[PDB]
Amino acid sequence: GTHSHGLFKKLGIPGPTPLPFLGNILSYHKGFCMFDMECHKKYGKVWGFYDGQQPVLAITDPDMIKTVLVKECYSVFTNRRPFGPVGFMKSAISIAEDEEWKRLRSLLSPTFTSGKLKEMVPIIAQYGDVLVRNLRREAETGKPVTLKDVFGAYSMDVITSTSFGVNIDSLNNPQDPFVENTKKLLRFDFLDPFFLSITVFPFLIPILEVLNICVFPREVTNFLRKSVKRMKESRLEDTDFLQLMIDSQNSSHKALSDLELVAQSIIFIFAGYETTSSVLSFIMYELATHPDVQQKLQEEIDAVLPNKAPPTYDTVLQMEYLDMVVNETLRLFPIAMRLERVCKKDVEINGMFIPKGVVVMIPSYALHRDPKYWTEPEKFLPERFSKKNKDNIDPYIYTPFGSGPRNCIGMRFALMNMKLALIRVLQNFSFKPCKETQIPLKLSLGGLLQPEKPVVLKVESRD
Amino acid sequence: GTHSHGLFKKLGIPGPTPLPFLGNILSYHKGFCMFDMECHKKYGKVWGFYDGQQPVLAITDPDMIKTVLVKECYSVFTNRRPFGPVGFMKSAISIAEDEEWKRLRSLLSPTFTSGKLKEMVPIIAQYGDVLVRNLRREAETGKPVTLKDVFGAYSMDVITSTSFGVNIDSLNNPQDPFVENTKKLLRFDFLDPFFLSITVFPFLIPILEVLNICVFPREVTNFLRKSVKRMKESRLEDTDFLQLMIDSQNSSHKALSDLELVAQSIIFIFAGYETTSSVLSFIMYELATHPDVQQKLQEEIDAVLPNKAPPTYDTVLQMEYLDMVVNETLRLFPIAMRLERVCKKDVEINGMFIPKGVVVMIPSYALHRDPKYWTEPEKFLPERFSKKNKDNIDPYIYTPFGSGPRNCIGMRFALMNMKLALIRVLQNFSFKPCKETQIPLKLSLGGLLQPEKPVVLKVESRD
Ligand code: HEM
Ligand code: HEM
Ligand SMILES: OC(Cn1cncn1)(Cn1cncn1)c1ccc(F)cc1F
Ligand SMILES: OC(Cn1cncn1)(Cn1cncn1)c1ccc(F)cc1F
């Protein structure tokens, strides 16, 4: 069961000794982030471990990281680890490979430009207002407030409107079908029984595909596929992502088909829905446990936007401390945790040989808390991202959205989305720890970056 | 079960309608060659069928064939269909892929040059003499002679000597270990229960690999691996392929390792052993059923080599009619039957779109018997390959060894090998049909190009 478990001993590369068949997976008992920090401390700048029989080489040298994510991206490090069983969701850009990915990224890039994002800001702003009305009703009843729920509704509202023109107050229609289905598109727990097993028996992935078993719930995807097929034909008569993609089908590429279009629509929901609500919850925890930060930010918002003035695209990008608070929260909680690329050819990068087929992994969470780059890394200190101090911040250490050609395509949208929500809420409310607030917050031990206990806070109206 | 069975209907490409899950495999009941001839006649110049869910596109236009095998070989059509479970035999050049194959073909090409072949001719000639002595003893007892056995011993003798310096009279030591093991390296029956099942459930191949199940008998390969490891270290103190490969390990490539070297040694045995004896048996059938051909050839040998003179490299290549007889036999019996390349990128070749992942198949057997290139294709007529008529012979229709960069690397060796045997035997014997000779010879219905009944003939001494 150790066909390939001698690879890192041969390369003279250090690392935790793997068990037969399991490789190192038993060390995931404390989750991805703990394993990566320990390996970093124990073994230093480079190490290896085995996901079953798959060798994973962790790298932490920023130059080596830039080779992987930027320099040799197209040549050597184009793809991520095979992810399935996926079915027709194989055509989603985040899952595609090589030339198919290159085409899809090209066909989809114009959809995410700052110009398009600016055009979508009025829609996103509408649902900040929906958020405040629903936040107030819970602020008007002295009842603690679980963040993930209120931001969940908000993220849902943004998604349905910006991707399909569906305009729903999802917290108050939690049971409309379109909410009912998209609500199921959550982050995957890559350490749950299923996804672990796929690591111990990946030779079982093609078997699942042949049985039409898919990691994306088949009902939800079918619901959306016909819904998209319905909208596409209704709009044909008489801003949203769907319309942008429909427009792109009217031109040097082949063009995206109808099924390629549905796969993007689904993957954007999946990428944005629970991620956005998770970060917003982490941000609010940091504000409630750091009231001066919350006060200073509330004063900054009030300066750019007096009389609780509605935020716009340009005023959002005017707010520095807002940017610093968002970025410092993404440093402590980089919710993807790791970046990965498959090494597709025998190569050598900055004087290290990398055998074809190794997964090169960048442990983002662990680097965000490295003392060798971040003083007092455990503390929420937004000053690190001040305009004076950002020059010493290495874009290859801080990678909440990845880097290079395969970085998060939704990065700009997601930052603007979250900033719009924080502005509107903070113009209206302050956020206070309850007795039931977990302090300090503790991270879950599974394959998701989330708190052990849900974040619950007091929400008082600024009247 | 028809995820991909609509591909050829979408491309407007004709072909036999596939069953769910099986694709078209049930049409292999009469073997590869019959299926290909029928499809050719029925559907014309291009058609499709499904090996389970794998789409296979047959092409017959010589220009399109040259694009596949020569023009876009490195760019698009580099690999054959995945073949496994193979274990460490994955490093054999005939199984390797992409850059690994390119390297191995480069590292091995100098081993097959005309210069090396000429140096090996004296060894091969020695076993022609062993052949004649063993043929005579069966010619001296008026007993019919099964060809595959006598040529089998000969092909075995050539292999052990040219690849390892092992010099054995294998017909008379049929039970020495080195014969015992290599005797098991026969052609695969790609239509037998196992290899069919791998076509209906190829998702089961990775499963077999994880269980260390291999299509090459594990005992034989282990026997040879240590035998090679033993010889490598004995020769180190105090012509063969092994020595040529050992020498290559002493130099712009990485160099072939010890295990890469063993994999070549094994694959060359496997490629040469039963193929050479099969063709030699087909040739002798054609001579016995065409005595004038046999007479004319025997007179040609006697002219170049008077007094039963031993053949040499240069006199072999002097014999035209010998060449014509060998080539006409390889036209009627091209024992690989088909050539294949995986289309690795969405491409278009001579105005036909080919989707990535399709297997492009060239049906060699069917083209060797096409009336649109070969008059009276069923008859053994060596005149087609006369120096006058060879100018109308299209190197992309006649492909007994394939074409392009991925053609049979052993072609020159195998022709010389067989020619040396035919010369020595025909200098000494004539070959006559017995009552028990199957006439006309009928091909087996399995996944091997072989006669239904074994070829048995009378062998009289020319004294
Ligand atoms: C705060 C929310 C989000 C975070 C932290 C985040 C983070 C990331 C990260 C770390 C990656 C991997 C980057 C790499 O491999 O270098 C990624 C990829 C990606 N993200 Fe996000 N993301 C977020 C929201 C979104 C949104 C709203 C979208 C909407 C379209 C989106 C679409 C994608 C896609 C399509 C990819 C794959 C890109 C490719 O393979 O070419 N993400 N994201
Ligand atoms: C009469 C005997 C033989 C015949 C008819 C034959 C025929 C063929 C054919 C049709 C192919 C496929 C070519 C293509 O895909 O274009 C091939 C490949 C090959 N043959 Fe043979 N062959 C014979 C004997 C040998 C021998 C004696 C060797 C000894 C080394 C050998 C080694 C190979 C190898 C290594 C390949 C794969 C080449 C590559 O993938 O680069 N064969 N042969
Ligand atoms: O898995 C992703 C990151 N990723 C994208 N391709 C490969 N990995 C999906 N995703 C992309 N944008 C948003 N989500 C992820 C999973 C969990 C998470 F918290 C963030 C995160 F990026
Ligand atoms: O399968 C082969 C041809 N081939 C090589 N790579 C892929 N296919 C093996 N082989 C190569 N030289 C000799 N044998 C074959 C099988 C049967 C046969 F009769 C000929 C034949 F070439």
Question: Under an 8 A CB cutoff, do A206 and B206 touch?
Answer: yes
Q: Which residues of B434-444 are buried (b: 16+ CB within 10 A; e: fewer)?
A: eeebeeebebe
**CATH number 1.10.630.10 given to B1-463:** yes
**Strand-strand pairing, B46-51 and B353-354:** unpaired
Q: How far is B136 from A408, CA to CA, in rounded Å? A: 78
Sheet (strand B359-362) strand order? B46-51, B54-59, B359-362, B339-342
Amino acid at B107: L
List CB contacts of A175: < 8 A, sequence separation 6 or more. none
Question: Would the CB of B363 count as within 6 Å of ligand 2?
Answer: no
Element (H, E) at B313: helix B313-316
B192 touches chain A (CB under 8 A): no
Return the amino acid letter for A455.
V
Contact B99 A346 (CB under 8 A): yes
Q: What six digits make up the tokens of A112? A: 């995410």
Ligand nearest to the CA of residue A406, numbered in listed order: 1
Residue type, A336: A
- Residue B408 in contact with residue B94, Cβ under 8 Å? no
Q: Kindly compute the dihedral angle of the four CA atoms of residues A141, A143, A146, A152, in this order, to the nearest 10 degrees.
A: -10
Q: Is there an atom of ligand 3 within 6 Å of A184 CB?
A: no
Cα–Cα distance for residue pair A136/A171, rounded to 1 Å? 13
Q: Which ligand 2 atom is the nearest neighbour of the CA of B413?
A: 27
Location of structure tokens 């299923």: A194
For residues A174 and A224, give the distance between their C-alpha atoms in angstroms, rounded to a whole number: 17
In one-letter notation, the amino acid at residue A330 is L
Which residues does ligand 1 sit against, CB inside 6 Å? A 69, 93-94, 105, 267-268, 271-272, 275-276, 279, 335-336, 339, 400-403, 406-410, 413-414
Q: How far is CA A238 from CA A165, A233, A234, A249, B292, in A?
A: 15, 11, 8, 19, 85
State how beta strands A54-59 and B353-354 pair. Answer: unpaired
In chain B, residues preceding a discontinuity (C to N beyond 2.5 A) are 238, 251
DSSP B372-405: TTSSSTTS--GGGGSTTTGGG--TTT--TT--ST
Distance CA A459, CA B312 (A): 99
**Helical (H) or strand (E) element with B360:** strand B359-362
- Cα distances from B205 to residues B176, B221, B267, in angstroms, run 34, 20, 20
* SS3 label, residue B79: coil
Burial pattern B402-414, b for ≥16 Cβ within 10 A else e, equals bbbebebbbebbb
Contact B207, A203 (CB under 8 A): yes
Is residue B319 a contact partner of residue B304, using CB atoms and an 8 Å limit? yes
User: For chain B, how far is it from start to end, CA to CA, in angstroms?
Assistant: 65
To the nearest whole Å, the CA of A105 is away from the closest chain B CA by 17
Collect all residues with Cβ–Cβ distance below 8 Å to B375 and sequence separation of at least 6. Answer: none
CB contact at 8 A, A367 and A399:
yes
A403 within 8 A of A69, measured Cβ to Cβ: yes
Nearest CA to ligand 1 atom 16: A402
| Residue B141: partners with Cβ closer than 8 Å, 6 or more residues away | none
Any long-range contacts for A287-291 (C-beta under 8 Å, 24+ apart)?
A287/A325, A287/A426, A287/A431, A288/A431, A288/A432, A288/A433, A288/A437, A288/A457, A288/A458, A289/A380, A289/A433, A289/A437, A289/A439, A289/A440, A290/A380, A291/A430, A291/A432
Of B292, B310, B340, nearest to B424 by C-alpha is: B310
- Size (chain B), residues: 463
Using CA atoms, how far residue A215 sits from A28, B89, B194, in Å, is 21, 34, 31
Token pair for A119? 């055009």
Whether ligand 3 lies within 6 angstroms of the CB of A275 is answered as yes
Q: Tell whether the torsion through CA atoms of A19, A23, A24 and A25 is positive or negative.
A: negative
CA B63 – CA B69 distance, rounded (Å): 10
Look up residue B73 and give its DSSP letter.
T
Distances (CA, A) of A359 to A51, A106, A272, A349: 10, 25, 26, 14
B210 → closest Cβ in A203, A209, A346: A203
A408 is in an annotated binding site: yes
CA distance B169 to B130: 7
CB B264 within 8 A of CB B225: no
Please, are residues A181 and A220 in contact by the beta-carbon 8 Å criterion?
yes
Q: Which atom of ligand 3 is nearest to the CA of A80?
A: 7
Task: Verify whether ligand 3 is closer than 6 Å to residue A94 (CB atom).
Answer: yes
Residue in B closest to A210 by C-alpha? B1
Torsion, Cα of B194, B199, B203, B209 (10° steps): 40
CA-nearest residue to B205 within chain A is A203
Per-position DSSP letters for B92-109, written without gaps between them: STTT--HHHHHHHHHHHG
* CB distance B335 to ligand 4 below 6 Å: yes
Asked if the peptide bond before residue B306 counts as cis, ω within 30 degrees of 0, the response is no
Q: What are the residue ranges of helices labelled H in B109-257? A: 114-139, 147-164, 177-182, 193-200, 205-210, 218-235, 241-248
Asked if A428 contacts A287 with a C-beta cutoff of 8 angstroms, the reply is: no
**Interrupted backbone of chain A, residues before each interruption (C–N > 2.5 Å):** 238, 251
* Rounded Cα gap, residues B231 and B224, in angstroms: 10
- Asked if the C-beta of B209 comes within 8 angstroms of chain A's C-beta atoms, the answer is yes
| C-alpha span between B302 and B243 (Å, rounded) | 35
For B456, the 3-state DSSP assignment is strand
Q: What distance in Å separates the CA atoms of residue A261 and residue A266, rounded to the nearest whole number?
A: 9
* Residue of chain B minimizing CA distance to A88: B3
How does strand A339-342 pair with strand B353-354?
A: unpaired
Distance CA A190, CA A196 (A): 7
In 3D space, the residue among A72, A84, A74, A68 whose CA is nearest the CA of residue A105 turns out to be A74
Residues 6+ apart with CB under 8 A from B12: none
Residue A267 CA to ligand 3 center (angstroms) comes to 10
Nearest 5°: the CA angle A401, A404, A408 is: 30
State which H helix or E strand residue B412 sits in.
Answer: helix B411-426
CB atoms within 10 A of CB B118: 15
Instruction: Classify A150 in phi/psi space as left (phi over 0), alpha (psi -120 to 50) or beta.
Output: alpha
Put residue A44 in one of left, alpha, beta given phi > 0 → left and psi -120 to 50 → alpha. left
Convert B230-246 to b/e letters by CB count within 10 Å (16 or more is b).
Answer: ebbeeeeeeebbbebbb
Contact between residue A54 and residue A359 where contact means Cβ atoms under 8 Å apart = yes
Q: Quick one: which of B242, B249, B272 has its CA closest to B409?
A: B272
- Scan residues 239-268 of A and list those with Cβ closer than 8 Å to B: 254
Cis-peptide into B85, omega within 30 deg: yes
Q: What is the 3-state secondary structure (H, E, C) of chain A?
A: CCCCCCHHHHCCCCCCCCECCCECHHHHHHHHHHHHHHHHHHHCCEEEEEECCEEEEEECCHHHHHHHHHHCCCCCCCCCCCCCCCHHHHHCCCCCCHHHHHHHHHHHHHHHCHHHHHHHHHHHHHHHHHHHHHHHHHHCCCCCEEHHHHHHHHHHHHHHHHHHCCCCCCCCCCCCHHHHHHCCCCCCCCCCHHHHHHHHCHHHHHHHHHCCCCCCCHHHHHHHHHHHHHHHHHHCCCCCHHHHHHHHCCCCCCCCCHHHHHHHHHHHHHHHHHHHHHHHHHHHHHHHCCHHHHHHHHHHHHHHCHHHCCCCHHHHCCCHHHHHHHHHHHHHCCCCCCEEEECCCCEECCCCEECCCCEEEECHHHHHCCCCCCCCCCCCCHHHHCCCCHHHCCCCCCCCCCCCCCCCCCHHHHHHHHHHHHHHHHCCEEEEECCCCCCCCCECCCCCCCECCCCEEEEEECC
* Chain A residues within 8 A of B99 when measuring between CB atoms: 345-346
- Residue matched to tokens 């073994």: A43
What method was applied to determine this entry?
A: X-ray
Q: How far apart are CA A294 and CA A284, in angstroms?
A: 9
Tokens of B297: 């050839």
- Cα distance between residue B170 and residue B172, in whole Å: 5
Which pair of structure tokens corresponds to residue B313?
């490299």
Residue whose C-alpha is closest to residue A429's, from A271, A240, A291 = A291
- The pair of three-digit structure tokens given for residue B399, joined into one six-digit string: 């492909």
Q: Which two tokens stand for residue B198?
A: 């791998």
Tokens at A416, concatenated: 């603007």
Residue B59, helix vs strand vs coil: strand
Peptide bond into A440 cis (omega under 30): yes
B441: closest CA among B370, B387, B380? Answer: B380
**Taken in order B166, B170, B173, B178, is the CA torsion positive or negative?**
positive
Please state the length of chain A.
Answer: 463
B21 torsion bin: left (phi>0), alpha (psi -120 to 50), beta (else): left
Report the C-alpha gap between A351 and A168 in whole angstroms.
Answer: 55
Our measurement of the distance from residue B178's CA atom to the centroid of its chain's CA atoms, rounded to an integer in Å, reads 22
CA neighbor of A34 nearest in space, from A365, A399, A442? A365
The answer to whether B340 touches B361, Cβ cutoff 8 Å, is yes
Is B236 in CB contact (< 8 Å) with chain A?
A: no
Beta strands at A359-362 and A54-59: parallel, antiparallel or unpaired: parallel
Residue A369: exposed, middle, or buried by beta-carbon count in 10 A (0-12, 13-18, 19+)? middle
Strand partners for A19: A23
With vertex at residue B211, the alpha carbon angle to CA B207 and CA B212, rounded to the nearest 5 degrees, is 115
10 Å Cβ neighbour count for B250?
A: 6
Q: Is B158 helix (H, G, I), strand (E, B) or coil?
A: helix
The angle that helices A258-288 and A291-304 make with each other, rounded to 10 degrees, is: 120
DSSP state of B67: I
H-helix or E-strand containing B348?
Answer: strand B347-348
Write b or e for each residue in B67-100: b if 16 or more Cβ atoms lie within 10 A of its Cβ, otherwise e. Answer: bbbbbbbeebbbbbeebbbbbbbbbbbbbbeeeb
Angle at the Cα of A259 (from A254 to A265), degrees rounded to 5? Answer: 105
Of residues B392, B350, B400, B390, the one with CA closest to residue B373 = B392
Helix (H, G, I), strand (E, B) or coil at B354: strand
Residue closest to A50 by CA, chosen among A16, A14, A12, A9: A16
Beta-strand pair B347-348/B339-342: unpaired
Cα–Cα dist A385/A365, whole Å: 17
Contact B165, B242 (CB under 8 A): yes
Q: What 8-state DSSP symbol labels residue B18?
A: P
Amino acid at A267: I
Find, among B144, B276, B200, B282, the residue nearest to B28 by Cα: B200
> Cα–Cα distances in Å, from A167 out to A117, A184, B429?
18, 18, 93
Distance of CA A129 to the CA centre of its chain: 24
Nearest to A327 by CA among A405, A403, A380, A273: A380
Cα–Cα–Cα angle for B298, B299, B304, rounded to 5 degrees:
100
Rounded Cα distance between B96 and B83, Å, is 10
Number of H helices, E strands in chain B: 17, 9
Distance CA A43, CA A415 (A): 35
Based on its alpha-carbon atoms, the radius of gyration of chain A, rounded to whole angstroms, reads 22
